[PDB]
């Protein structure tokens, strides 16, 4: 079974350097060539290089040479990948990947986010129903969940008991290098003030919990 | 230069049990001198990584399903789904490796088709806790709409917003097949206290004509 297993999310300054890992297993390591790929939604998808862990030759992407830099550990069958001199252009999710003759299985990823902020929990505001939020029978409301870092930060609401027609919207990275995000609901229209709505908000990297009740 | 693979179309709507087609070119011949044509073709589902169907240009990668054939002539490739199921949804990628450095395409995004929905739209001024605190963000929602493609515009007291605002899409929707926007507008309390009309305008193809939903503080 072949396995390629990559390290964990890495948070570094701009400047700063980071080496990613990719352990293998269920092929013997020294016989075929180990590759990295960048995943940016700037750039789509970029072979950066490749590496012979028989003899260590590197073959690279021109547009990474001196960026990264790849490395084998035999005795783990680890791949590794050493990027320096990190801007936010080299914020991207990276994978390792094995040859096709092997089945050409991909890692998981690993996320790299180059950024100057400190960790830091959000504040949640919420977004009440009104005239303005209703269609008819239907009324929308919602939490904004603000100015934090890193992602990410989850949302429930009812306490896991409210799910239909809940949207929690992916992240914006704001241009003070915190981000946002909204969670909303649609609900019956007739239900608001009978039922109460609470937004359940949680930012783990900085220990904060917060519930917020939502009303008109 | 760089060898480009051009993917095409970006979006490919299809409902569940079509055929699906979907191209890709090759800005060089892909040919190797070992004969060999090392086009490859991957599935890329949401917050997962690059799986591999086809590899050097027909050959189907051992338990990838047979409904999935590679086909095409040199420069022109093509991946044929025979039998479309919610498994085969994603990105699909081509990608080559006859010539350093190795290249991708941009991916064709495979997606269920629906009947065009019309978004529900909302407006959510910016709370009171919120100003005490300095900032106003006023949310525009775009709920349950199809297809994709939305424009949200703000105005506030007629003057058009560019730069000021950020948008995020929720992935198709499971049951329903919709997609749901929200579009945040960013302005200072002192801003924000300046002005009256704040609107959002949505331009869609399910609806007549765009339309607007406001409010005055």
């Known amino acids: 079974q072949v396995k390629l297993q990559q390290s964990g999310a890495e948070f570094v300054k701009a400047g700063a350097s980071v080496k990613l890992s990719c352990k293998t297993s269920?092929?013997?390591?020294?016989?075929?060539?180990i590759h990295w790929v960048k995943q940016s939604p700037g750039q789509g998808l970029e072979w950066i290089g490749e590496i012979d862990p028989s003899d260590g030759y590197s073959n690279y992407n021109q547009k990474f040479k001196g960026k990264a830099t790849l490395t084998v550990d035999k005795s783990s069958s680890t791949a590794y990948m050493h990027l320096n001199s990190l801007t936010s252009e080299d914020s991207a999710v990276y994978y390792c990947?094995?040859?096709?003759?092997?089945?050409?299985?991909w890692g998981q990823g690993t996320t790299v986010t180059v950024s100057s902020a400190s960790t830091k929990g959000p504040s949640v505001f919420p977004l009440a129903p009104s005239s303005k939020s209703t269609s008819g029978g239907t009324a929308a409301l919602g939490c904004l969940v603000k100015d934090y870092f890193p992602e990410p930060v989850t949302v429930s609401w009812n306490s896991g008991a409210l799910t239909s027609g809940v949207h929690t919207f992916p992240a914006v990275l704001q241009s003070s290098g915190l981000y946002s995000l909204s969670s909303v609901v649609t609900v019956p229209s007739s239900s608001l003030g009978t039922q109460t709505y609470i937004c359940n908000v949680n930012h783990k990297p900085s220990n904060t919990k917060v519930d917020k009740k939502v009303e008109p | 230069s760089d060898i480009e693979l051009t993917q095409s179309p970006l979006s490919l709507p299809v409902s569940l049990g079509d055929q699906a087609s979907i191209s890709c070119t090759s800005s060089?011949?892909?040919?190797?001198?070992?004969?060999?044509?090392?086009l490859h073709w991957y599935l890329q589902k949401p917050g997962q990584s690059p799986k591999l169907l086809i590899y050097t240009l027909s050959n189907r990668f051992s338990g990838v399903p047979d409904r999935f054939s590679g086909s095409g002539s040199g420069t022109d490739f093509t991946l044929k789904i025979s039998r479309v199921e919610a498994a085969d949804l994603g990105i699909y990628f081509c990608?080559?490796?006859?010539?350093?450095?190795?290249?991708f395409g941009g991916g064709t995004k495979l997606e269920i088709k629906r009947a065009d929905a019309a978004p529900s739209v909302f407006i959510f001024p910016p709370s009171d806790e919120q100003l005490k605190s300095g900032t106003a963000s006023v949310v525009c929602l775009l709920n349950n709409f199809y297809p994709r493609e939305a424009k949200v515009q703000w105005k506030v007291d007629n003057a058009l917003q560019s730069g000021n605002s950020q948008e995020s899409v929720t992935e198709q929707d499971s049951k329903d097949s919709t997609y749901s926007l929200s579009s945040t507008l960013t302005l200072s309390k002192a801003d924000y206290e300046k002005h009256k009309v704040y609107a959002c305008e949505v331009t869609h193809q399910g609806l007549s004509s765009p339309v607007t939903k406001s409010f005055n503080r």
């Open positions: 269920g092929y013997t390591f020294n016989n075929y060539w």
């Open positions: 990947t094995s040859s096709t003759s092997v089945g050409g299985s």
């Open positions: 060089q011949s892909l040919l190797h001198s070992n004969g060999d044509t090392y």
């Open positions: 990608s080559q490796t006859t010539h350093v450095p190795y290249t």
